[PDB]
Amino acid sequence: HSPILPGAWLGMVGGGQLGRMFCFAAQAMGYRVAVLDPDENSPAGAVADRHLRAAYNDEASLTELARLCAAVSTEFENVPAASLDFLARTTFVSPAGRCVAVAQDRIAEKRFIASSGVTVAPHVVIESSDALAALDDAKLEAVLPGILKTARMGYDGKGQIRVRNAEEVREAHASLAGVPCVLEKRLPLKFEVSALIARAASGASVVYPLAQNTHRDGVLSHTIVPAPDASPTLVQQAQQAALQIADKLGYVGVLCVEFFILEDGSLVANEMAPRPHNSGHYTVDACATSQFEQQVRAMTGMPLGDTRQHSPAVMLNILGDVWFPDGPKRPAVTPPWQEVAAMPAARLHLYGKEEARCGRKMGHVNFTAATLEEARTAARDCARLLHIIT
Ligand SMILES: Nc1ncnc2c1ncn2[C@@H]1O[C@H](COP(=O)(O)O)[C@@H](O)[C@H]1O
Numbered sequence: 240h241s242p243i244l245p246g247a248w249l250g251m252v253g254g255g256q257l258g259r260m261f262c263f264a265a266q267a268m269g270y271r272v273a274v275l276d277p278d279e280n281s282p283a284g285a286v287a288d289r290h291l292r293a294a295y296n297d298e299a300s301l302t303e304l305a306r307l308c309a310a311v312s313t314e315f316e317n318v319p320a321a322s323l324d325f326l327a328r329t330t331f332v333s334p335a336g337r338c339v340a341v342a343q344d345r346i347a348e349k350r351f352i353a354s355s356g357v358t359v360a361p362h363v364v365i366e367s368s369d370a371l372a373a374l375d376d377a378k379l380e381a382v383l384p385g386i387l388k389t390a391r392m393g394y395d396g397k398g399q400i401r402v403r404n405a406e407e408v409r410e411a412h413a414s415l416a417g418v419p420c421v422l423e424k425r426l427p428l429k430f431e432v433s434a435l436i437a438r439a440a441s442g443a444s445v446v447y448p449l450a451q452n453t454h455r456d457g458v459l460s461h462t463i464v465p466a467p468d469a470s471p472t473l474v475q476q477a478q479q480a481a482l483q484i485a486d487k488l489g490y491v492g493v494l495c496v497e498f499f500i501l502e503d504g505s506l507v508a509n510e511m512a513p514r515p516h517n518s519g520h521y522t523v524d525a526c527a528t529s530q531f532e533q534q535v536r537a538m539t540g541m542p543l544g545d546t547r548q549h550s551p552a553v554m555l556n557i558l559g560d561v562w563f564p565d566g567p568k569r570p571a572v573t574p575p576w577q578e579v580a581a582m583p584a585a586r587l588h589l590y591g592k593e594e595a596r597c598g599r600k601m602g603h604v605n606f607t608a609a610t611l612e613e614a615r616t617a618a619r620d621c622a623r624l625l626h627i628i629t
């Protein structure tokens with residue numbers, strides 16, 4: 240792979256906030272970015288050097304994107320692997336369609352992670368209605384109470400149903416229209432962490448510090464780095480697990496692997512994203528090389544960047560609910576950004592989305608400081624200010 244040098248066109252399939260942040264990182268280094276996204280108002284397309292407004296399966300636009308760009312990546316985990324393989328006919332695609340296909344499917348990803356030697360949650364795979372009908376209640380009850388999750392990803396807790404008994408599993412499967420699913424045992428969680436790595440085509444890799452993530456209603460709420468409750472032994476185990484997965488996958492790009500730490504202290508892998516990740520946004524303001532810059536380097540064949548964390552950090556997600564302090568039925572109220580910017584630790588990132596809606600990620604605020612406790616205090620003060628907490 241002869242390195243793709245500054246000045247080239249780089250392609251981005253998907254135009255959300257992750258694609259927007261990729262644009263800034265690539266453009267700062269002198270690259271030009273073409274974003275393929277069907278939405279007219281895409282956050283990434285707004286800042287890109289070129290926006291191809293097209294469906295992800297549109298042959299003419301895929302051909303146009305691959306002709307223009309020396310390398311193409313994605314920020315969209317559910318992108319069709321066939322689209323990435325189509326692009327790969329004429330240009331370099333990182334990560335490959337084959338890798339994204341494993342990572343985007345909950346059944347395949349848990350099989351693959353287990354085959355890498357990494358523990359996953361006890362679960363039962365439900366390929367179809369016919370397969371579920373042949374399973375006895377006892378096979379289901381072994382993983383109950385549990386969560387029934389569609390294999391095809393639903394972001395933000397979508398496509399998931401709590402189930403307490405076998406009859407609830409069977410009704411839940413029908414409610415999900417019979418699609419392939421994984422039934423996972425609900426586990427006793429002490430805390431949650433994510434490992435963030437980047438891997439080059441050569442097999443070289445870098446690792447970020449472990450992040451400790453808190454979710455509300457299945458949506459990431461905040462991230463604390465370095466993880467305050469993860470020992471150096473656990474950090475190495477989680478980083479190594481993510482590297483072992485990436486190596487076995489032949490993965491080129493940025494990979495985020497989310498883990499549970501149970502009450503007994505064991506490490507359980509849950510999910511992996513074949514892209515930069517919401518829990519990696521802190522890297523923009525806390526680390527020498529951000530995850531978006533790693534995505535540039537990996538897809539261009541350039542050397543991977545130093546991951547050194549120069550400042551402890553906390554990321555706070557900003558959801559559209561922040562605009563509805565008097566409830567969802569009442570009018571929107573613009574959040575108090577002037578008071579956020581008055582916090583010395585606050586690094587404000589707003590995505591340019593026009594309409595605030597509950598559950599919608601509108602931005603995030605990174606808090607960096609000399610010490611983690613100062614950063615955590617500022618994030619909590621900001622959460623109270625924004626009515627994220629009382
Ligand atoms: N097997 C499980 N046991 C306990 N909590 C879970 C389990 N699976 C998912 N969750 C919770 O739901 C969140 C999002 O789930 P997921 O859609 O699997 O990423 C996770 O970050 C957990 O907090």
Ligand SMILES: [Mg+2]
Nearest residue numbers: 342343511512
């Ligand atoms: Mg995944």
